[PDB]
Symmetry: D2
Subunit: 343 residues, 4 copies
């Protein structure tokens, strides 16, 4: 009973933080009818942002025309306003008809701080492009977007590893039942790592190190999975290994299950679970092959292991994801759906 | 002074040569590869990941001089045709990567050739496989062909044995996040070994792959209880092994770390510093346990235990290789 | 016209890709040193150039591309390749091992009619950079060269200077992506080069360059020389040229001359781009006006001009353009 | 024993600190940055490109100990508010990259502050700019603010002076193929300095850029005769400078190389080995001439001359910086 809007009824979106996720979100929204970006807020001039939209190291040239103007830029003829406001409270989103804001700066990833966007002359709702705490509904599309009714003011689109892990873990649960599991993500380097050894503003002694020249251990925002799959809460934990590729990642999960299984049964379950969000492949691919994909998670049957020792089984399952575009695809899918049921 | 020969003056061969400079009673008198001495002399002097050679290297005819001492160089394809005895060589380091079996490594042993061979890699189940300070007991000195194992094996072995001896291991799964190597392609192209993943550009990709860690040969009681795989990533050297395992006893994170510290020696290191891969380049430990990455997950009375150890696939292995070579040379009967 | 590819490597595979969108050119036979499954996989998936735009399915003795079967063979000697069996008239020699008239001719026997070498092929072989000197071709030739990637970059930029201002002399530096003939890690280089021996994705590596040109622009013969700096990117390059000219010039005049010279082969841009922005482009050379310098000291001028190129796809685009044109003149 | 302070414990600051351990007249008693001592202690111990610290480092309150000796750490944003005198500091190494001018570097000199300042970068035309063993003659010891030049300047200077003194230089154009640096972005993003190229992912691109060596302050006679640019490329340190020039005299390749060998010293190295960038990481030469890359093109009586020298933008510069600091400290 959610009375969703048609794609002909156009919801106007604002992007706070025109960074990797923000710019890629903007790109995908070009091919979503009924969602449209009318306002961008960052910490720089429009020429910088226009240039970064046109040209993209890992994701290729922009599919269209971009021309700089005063106080903004034009994309395929359509003007988009640019502002440079530090404080989310001072952003006059309503001036440009913006109802929903994509919070993509990485600095306001909580209910309290994201709410600052909602005020007079501001926005109605906010989607955080990251984990946003336990008091915020956290959505991985085609896994738990049921939870949305449309009344919510602040929601989270989860992390990129969460979007990778979730469908793979849920497939295990639903078919076999999961007792417990440990996860390792072999992950591309990101903007919060230092280009060369130097003082990390977050106090992390490992993110302080040269990210494109090191294997760097680190924490992960997907262990936060109980918010997406309630029945698995407290049963999964894990960590990351940040490695020298500018984008593209893979999640390994080692787990104990309720029932006995074979490699063939596991792969078959994953193929059966496949959809627009959760992909399936039996090709021996590498990280560059998943750059720019629209799947939130791509299961790799070639890496599946089922070890049996004295009646006991450890099960290993592995799924690829482009931490940039895979997440962004899921983010926009969640945004689109949320916009149509917004109250 | 036992005189050694190196077949395959590659990454492991050149680094083995370097370490042997500081081992009294071991000395390299003959090198065999597929190239001229100028190429090899240059590759010894200058090293991308391991730094400049600590000494003098000057090219001569049919060889080169290292700190005054001449070392002969030959370019023989077939191990059968290498006249090792001419230069007083008794033991050969087989480091080409093309003769890693008993049958093929034996070809070094003939008249005018060598007496013994150490393979710098896994060499099959009919060859004693040694990780130093873990199972070098098995050597009596009568053996003709031995294996020094793989680099991941030298990393995993002491960490796994420490778990076994203290707590007892039921089963375990391993992932090594591993530097790229010479058998990967620099850019996408046909791999001569038929591997569709090693075919891909190794310095521009996360590349899944099999792993040579053959652990039951080193720790017999764990045979068939451990399996694993690799993720090859863009660093020119330096690696880390993660092991997830179930144990016979209940444990805490503190107990696990304490067991590892107690097990520490020249081969097995210990650290509580939050280090990264570049910090282990050139170390002499075969394995360096990292207490900062230890996990002990407890869910409904059941425990999964995660333990992680660093290793420089190049120098860590080479240090272990030379330690094993030194010891084997002294008991050679 | 039915084409054969010898050496299904970086250039061979990318040539194959471009030929899909050239009507009247079609690849019916591939020869390499491996099984079809390896080659089919390498066609589908490409680190730097992206996934294949189509379907690839492995068969016996070959593979299918969008339904069409393409035969695969594994013959080491070009003399033993029975090209005629598959109606092949022209062969793309892309192995890097037969880059001379003598050795490339070995394809022509009872086999193929003609051969295009995907590299410099000596002074006794017509060397073509498309839209610069493809006028040279009459169609009777048995063996031709498509030049090198740096040659295709430099040529239109250097000719534009000559035609407008006249060139006295010049020195060139290409800051170049690493290539397959470099070692992944320090090791013995089969060609004897002590620098290509070194880890190519972890070093700035000085090296020689195959663009030292008089074969493409006769009037500039012996007036240009240069070198390379190989650097850690898997593809994408840039050529810098410092030169003395016959006439006095300004920065504006130079850029204007380059824009006037622009076409399908020679691009023009005033955007401050980087190497990743030129990966996969179809221009053989893309002049960058932002890097132009004209230094004047005591009446004398040094002139600096810079052009981008994807050593892989830029060259391949030029190669296929030259192949298409050469095929049509029987 | 002259007591030194480091403002900005970054790449140059930390490496300067390392080299000062083996300089007897010089000692670091105070470090100022924007972080806690644990972060700085860790970054001193472990170094991606330059290797582990040769010694012992242990964290304390308000500082850390190095081989037993305590060094104080503070976190003051404004150079005016740094009480250098408290720790006996006379000379400050300004290594933040944010105070590279006479005006802004002078802010270190006040009551309870420092006496003198060495900027680890170009610092404008009103500040004596020194490349050691090329023009450190210029120093008399009365100066309040000096510059140690840039890394490319320290590379280029001895190579260019050798050309001038032997053959005479008419004009020249320079290209440095340079390692990426901290002021580039790790991934595509808004550059705080407004540069659209430094905005791009530095470890995944060839990135054109300006250069801080484009030299008349170091070699007066060459002023306005040289200009150039950079190509930033994916290595975490290590660089090479190419110079193409016209000369007053005719020359051969052998004569050029011979002139460079004759000019060699502790600052200016010479080599005939075909080396690559990793081979110069951590060297103490400010500039290392490579004879293998020399070219002398002759066309119709006219000559273009190409000369190339290696440098570790990090340690080569730092070696020169400390040599200049040592000498400057001695003549106060
Ligand atoms: N990159 C990924 O792989 C990835 C994946 C999933 C989620 N995320 C999340 O998305 C968010 C951003 O990630 P990213 O990698 O795109 O970040 P980024 O660093 O690339 O971009 C952040 C942008 O925010 C801007 N910004 C910073 N402070 C601001 C302020 N006060 N006001 C306005 N703008 C400001 C910056 O100028 C920059 O343009 C984070 O929450 C991150 O956790 C990132
Ligand atoms: N590099 C590592 O991380 C590592 C660690 C442990 C073990 N290993 C093992 O050590 C061996 C060598 O590895 P690498 O990376 O040092 O090899 P590499 O590719 O660097 O060197 C192989 C060398 O052997 C030479 N060679 C090849 N065929 C030959 C022949 N028929 N006769 C004489 N010389 C020949 C080559 O010229 C080359 O110098 C392999 O078995 C490998 O599995 C490697
Ligand atoms: N990639 C570039 O940057 C570039 C640009 C312009 C020109 N070229 C030239 O193109 C040629 C190929 O370069 P590449 O980069 O594609 O190299 P590559 O190494 O990727 O391709 C060579 C291919 O030929 C095959 N091959 C080798 N020997 C053979 C034989 N005897 N018979 C049949 N097949 C054989 C190999 O298996 C490999 O797949 C070279 O001449 C090179 O100089 C390269
Ligand atoms: N790295 C090189 O290649 C190189 C070579 C020659 C010269 N330089 C010069 O050295 C200077 C610094 O270079 P870098 O690459 O080491 O920088 P960096 O980014 O490594 O270090 C800068 C340090 O200064 C600190 N800092 C910033 N603002 C500060 C303030 N207000 N007060 C105290 N500390 C502050 C930072 O936290 C950081 O630790 C620049 O002027 C640069 O031109 C660098
Ligand atoms: O920082 C951004 C990451 O891409 C998302 O976090 P994660 O790797 O833990 O999922
Ligand atoms: O060839 C590579 C080294 O021997 C180590 O590889 P590994 O993971 O099989 O031990
Ligand atoms: O063109 C072939 C290789 O890419 C090398 O290029 P180059 O000879 O133009 O320098
Ligand atoms: O940004 C820091 C540079 O290293 C400064 O030195 P440079 O101008 O000589 O390149």
């Amino acid at each position: 009973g959610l009375v969703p809007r048609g794609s002909h009824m156009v919801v106007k979106v604002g992007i706070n933080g025109f960074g990797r996720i923000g710019r890629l979100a903007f790109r995908r929204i070009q091919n979503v009818e009924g969602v449209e970006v009318t306002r961008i807020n960052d910490l720089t001039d429009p020429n910088m942002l226009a240039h970064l939209l046109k040209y993209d190291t890992t994701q290729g040239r922009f599919d269209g025309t971009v021309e700089v103007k005063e106080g903004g830029f034009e994309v395929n003829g359509q003007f988009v306003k640019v502002s440079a406001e530090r404080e989310p409270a001072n952003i006059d989103w309503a001036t440009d008809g913006v109802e929903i804001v994509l919070e993509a700066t990485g600095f306001f990833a909580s209910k309290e701080k994201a709410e600052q966007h909602i005020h007079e002359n501001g926005a109605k709702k906010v989607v955080i492009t990251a984990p946003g705490g336990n008091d915020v509904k956290t959505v991985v599309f085609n896994t738990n977007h049921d939870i949305l009714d449309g009344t919510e003011t602040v929601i989270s689109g989860a992390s990129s590893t969460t979007n990778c892990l979730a469908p793979m873990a849920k497939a295990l649960q639903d078919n076999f039942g999961v007792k417990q599991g440990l996860m390792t993500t072999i992950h591309a380097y990101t903007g919060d790592q230092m280009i060369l050894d130097g003082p990390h503003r977050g106090g992390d002694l490992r993110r302080a190190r040269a990210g494109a020249a090191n294997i760097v251990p680190n924490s992960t925002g997907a262990a936060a999975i109980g918010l997406v799959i309630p029945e698995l809460n407290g049963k999964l934990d894990g960590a990351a290994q940040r490695v020298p590729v500018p984008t593209g990642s893979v999640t390994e999960l080692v787990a104990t299950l309720e029932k006995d299984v074979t490699v063939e049964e596991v792969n078959a379950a994953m193929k059966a679970a496949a959809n627009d969000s959760y992909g399936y492949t039996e090709d021996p691919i590498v990280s560059s092959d998943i750059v720019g994909i629209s799947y939130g998670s791509l299961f790799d049957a070639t890496q599946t292991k089922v070890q049996t020792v004295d009646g006991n089984q450890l099960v290993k399952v592995v799924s690829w994801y482009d931490n940039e575009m895979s997440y962004t695809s899921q983010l926009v899918r969640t945004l689109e759906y949320f916009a149509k049921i917004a109250k």
